[PDB]
Symmetry: C2
Subunit: 106 residues, 2 copies
């Protein structure tokens, strides 16, 4: 299965749920994930222009599909195919985000 | 906050995440929610025609926004404004659902 997380909405977007597949892909257990913004997976060779695109998509509540370099707990880089989408309530306000992580490393 | 759950997709759709607001609205703790299909909230005066529309929408991966009578743990009925949406993966397969529960009792 792909990794999946749920976050709160802004301004902090902490992770409130992470599936077991996300822990397998990233090397972090739930206690090392919950309450953190997902940017902790980024590292020195992550493309900061893609990170900025992600930031802007989330701020505008626009779904985004893109590929980003992330790092396992042990420091190994991997390619994450990310899909990040808002969850809206009865008045169309954004109350959470869902993220899917697919390890697309060849 | 509205209640929010995440479920797996078919054929069983068990709940894999429930927020604190869902436990406050329904009166059930997380230990008594996780692993269950959300239909446990229904009871004797729930409209079985609306339940069927929800079943059909989920089976077709169509979002549905509707109002349904549900029951708190203590037996008190309440009106739940339900919003149930699929989560799609990189090849557009449905891999989860998100549900929002807004208590709209007068
Ligand atoms: C639901 C969700 C899931 C996310 N998953 C990841 C992820 O797996 N890897 C990642 O590098 N960033 C992920 N992000 C993006 C970061 O949380 C953050 O939005 C990004 O780094 C841009 O914001 P910043 O410039 O403040 O860091 C996710 C964000 C959300 C809302
Ligand atoms: C994400 C999600 C959330 C749901 N939330 C509720 C809910 O709060 N209350 C409810 O009565 N049914 C809820 N349902 C609907 C039931 O799980 C089920 O789909 C419905 O009873 C129709 O199927 P059935 O005829 O097999 O019971 C939810 C379903 C999903 C997928």
């Amino acid at each position: 299965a792909s990794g999946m997380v749920v976050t709160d909405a802004g301004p902090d977007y902490p992770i409130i749920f992470a599936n077991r597949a996300f822990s397998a892909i990233t090397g972090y257990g739930p206690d090392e994930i919950l309450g953190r913004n997902a940017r902790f997976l980024q590292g020195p060779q992550t493309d900061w222009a893609v990170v900025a695109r992600i930031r802007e998509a989330i701020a505008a509540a626009r779904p985004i599909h893109t590929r980003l370099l992330n790092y396992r707990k042990d420091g190994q880089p991997f390619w994450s195919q990310l899909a990040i989408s808002p969850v809206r309530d009865e008045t169309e306000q954004v109350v959470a985000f869902v993220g899917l992580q697919t390890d697309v490393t060849a």
